[PDB]
């Protein structure tokens, strides 16, 4: 709500139609001829694709015969636009990268863009339903900028991607909306033990050319960190020119002078303009190499700076390949705390869902009364509201598991819960410490029917953006005069929830 002067994403008519060919038409020449020429004028529509449209035709009159024509050229474009560049054969359930190039052919006017990668439940992105992913950027006239976007194809087939870019103090917006093919792997055979109870209850009546070790480390003395790469080739003789595509964690830029220091470096070269590009939106870097070795580790490292402060940061990406071959490439993503730089998602036998939205419903608001408390408990969404005790804890890299001890079923929902039962609630590793959670403590909790992990009775629980959790002390831990106000609203919440039940 900072600035009021942009076109709402909700009103950004994207580019939609991108046929690789069309107008298979067949039209007849009824016009009264002049000069021995009937003339036809077919008013048509211009597809949402920016290219010169070549037009090829053939006149089949039975009297004179066939006749090819001089192809016709209709030159289509806008001053400022996008084109989106994707792969084709992507694999479901594997984090990938895309690049979006906005071109600006305005001769003298720079531009500031707020562009959103648009949310899609078929993809694990950074864009939740409610938490937008808007990046703000600036463009030199008669220049274009490369924007990376790393995602997870959660589903198969024809998936469309959309990105809507809107501008400030000016006119146009645009949007790309482009499909491609997603497909499955099928292995699910990673270091399985002989009987791991993977099976359900109710059924039944890759870098082959390249070594690539990338690690982003921190700096000694806004914030600057180290990027480290460590590369090799696997073959009999050393290999030809290899290329690196490197992209910046949201709002990052390298150290301009260390960049310069490295380019004079042996066996290396980065042209001047991608090397004296401006600090304003210097975001994607391409470094070409003379050759790469098959014999040992030749690493590199350099600095990165934080241009804009946002709490959450897209992983950086690094894609390396031989000059001749793109398709046998190797791609790594980095993030300092995320190992191998991969987004948090949640995975079972072949399904995954994106676990990257806010840890729990936002706390610390001025309003903590029964009035709002009940309102978020009287909503229909609330399937379950429990009060348990933090009994056990499995901590791990992926997620951190809190074993909860349900003694009472306050409001079961679509759940069949017995009394004195032990059930598994999850919280992502990015959230763990923000929760300030300790075992042996009681907790009164609630969520939705949609927020249940698994199927019965081998199920689990997930704390999401709208899950509400709060610790419950003992009787000997609420007698303090300071702790009155909490334990007051706890007693009155309970009883009026209990006696009245839900209203409906």
């Amino acid at each position: 709500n900072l600035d009021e002067d942009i076109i709402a994403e909700e009103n950004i008519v994207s580019r939609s139609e991108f046929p690789e060919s069309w107008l298979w038409n067949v039209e007849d020449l009824k016009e009264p001829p002049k000069n021995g020429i009937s003339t036809k004028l077919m008013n048509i529509f211009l597809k949402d694709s920016i290219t010169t449209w070549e037009i090829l035709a053939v006149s089949m009159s039975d009297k004179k015969g066939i006749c090819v024509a001089d192809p016709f050229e209709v030159t289509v474009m806008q001053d400022f636009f996008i084109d989106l560049r994707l792969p084709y054969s992507v694999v479901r359930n594997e984090q990938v990268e895309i690049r979006a190039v906005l071109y600006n052919y305005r001769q003298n006017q720079e531009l500031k863009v707020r562009v959103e990668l648009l949310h899609n439940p078929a993809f694990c992105s950074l864009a939740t339903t409610k938490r937008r992913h808007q990046q703000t950027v600036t463009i030199p006239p008669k220049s274009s900028l490369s924007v990376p976007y790393v995602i997870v194809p959660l589903k198969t087939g024809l998936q469309e991607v959309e990105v809507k870019a809107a501008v400030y103090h000016h006119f146009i917006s645009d949007g790309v909306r482009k499909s491609l093919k997603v497909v499955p792997e099928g292995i699910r055979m990673n270091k399985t033990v002989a009987v791991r109870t993977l099976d359900p209850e109710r059924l039944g009546r890759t870098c082959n050319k390249f070594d690539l070790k990338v690690t982003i480390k921190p700096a000694p003395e806004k914030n600057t960190m180290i990027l480290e790469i460590c590369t090799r080739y696997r073959g009999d003789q050393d290999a030809t020119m290899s290329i690196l595509d490197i992209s910046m964690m949201t709002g990052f830029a390298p150290d301009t002078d260390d960049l310069k220091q490295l380019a004079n470096g042996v066996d290396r070269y980065i042209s001047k303009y991608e090397l004296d590009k401006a600090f304003s939106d210097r975001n994607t870097l391409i470094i070409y190499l003379d050759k790469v070795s098959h014999s040992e580790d030749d690493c590199l490292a350099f600095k990165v700076h934080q241009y804009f402060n946002v709490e959450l940061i897209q992983p950086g990406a690094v894609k390396v390949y031989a000059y001749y071959n793109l398709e046998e490439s190797c791609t790594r993503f980095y993030h300092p705390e995320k190992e191998d730089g991969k987004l948090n998602k949640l995975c079972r036998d072949e399904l995954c869902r994106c676990a990257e939205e806010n840890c729990f419903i936002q706390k610390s608001d001025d309003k903590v009364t029964l009035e709002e408390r009940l309102d978020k408990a009287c909503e229909p969404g609330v399937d379950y509201v429990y009060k348990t005790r933090l009994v056990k804890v499995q901590l791990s890299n992926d997620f951190d598991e809190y074993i909860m001890a349900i003694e009472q079923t306050i409001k079961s929902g679509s759940d069949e819960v017995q009394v004195g039962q032990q059930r598994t609630f999850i919280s992502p590793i990015k959230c763990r410490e923000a929760l300030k959670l300790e075992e042996k403590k009681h907790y009164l909790m609630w969520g939705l029917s949609s927020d249940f992990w698994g199927e019965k009775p081998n199920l689990s629980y997930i704390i999401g953006k709208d899950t509400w959790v709060e610790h419950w002390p003992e009787e000997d831990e609420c007698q303090d005069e300071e702790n009155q106000k909490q334990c007051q609203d706890l007693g009155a919440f309970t009883e009026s929830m209990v006696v009245f039940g839900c209203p409906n």
Binding site: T51, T52, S146
Partner: protein, 108 residues
């Protein structure tokens, strides 16, 4: 290439003009990967020493293969066997975006 063929005594070696342009009608700013080779009927032989990494300037470019470099490669230095052999050129250009990539070729 300047002339459709390769002149055996052309001291210049070979000067090549790279034209790279967007489909919509605008010129491209970038950098190029140029590799050549020889084809003998169905038999093609790649020419590894000639690859040049070269910039692309406002939708225009020049590259030059000096005769000195050219002749160092050759296997059998000068013979009649060489005639009947044609040349093919593979071009890989990357935008300043680092994103889009095009494979191009002049053969024959």
């Amino acid at each position: 290439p300047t002339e459709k063929f390769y002149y055996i005594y052309n001291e210049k070696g070979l000067e090549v003009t790279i034209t790279a342009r967007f489909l919509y009608g605008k010129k491209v700013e970038g950098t190029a990967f140029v590799i050549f080779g020889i084809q003998d009927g169905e038999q093609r032989i790649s020419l590894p020493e000639s690859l040049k990494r070269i910039p692309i300037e406002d939708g225009s470019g020049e590259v030059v293969l000096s005769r000195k470099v050219l002749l160092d490669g050759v296997q059998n230095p000068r013979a009649e066997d060489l005639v009947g052999k044609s040349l093919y050129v593979s071009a890989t250009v990357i935008l300043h975006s680092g994103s889009d990539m095009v494979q191009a070729e002049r053969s024959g």
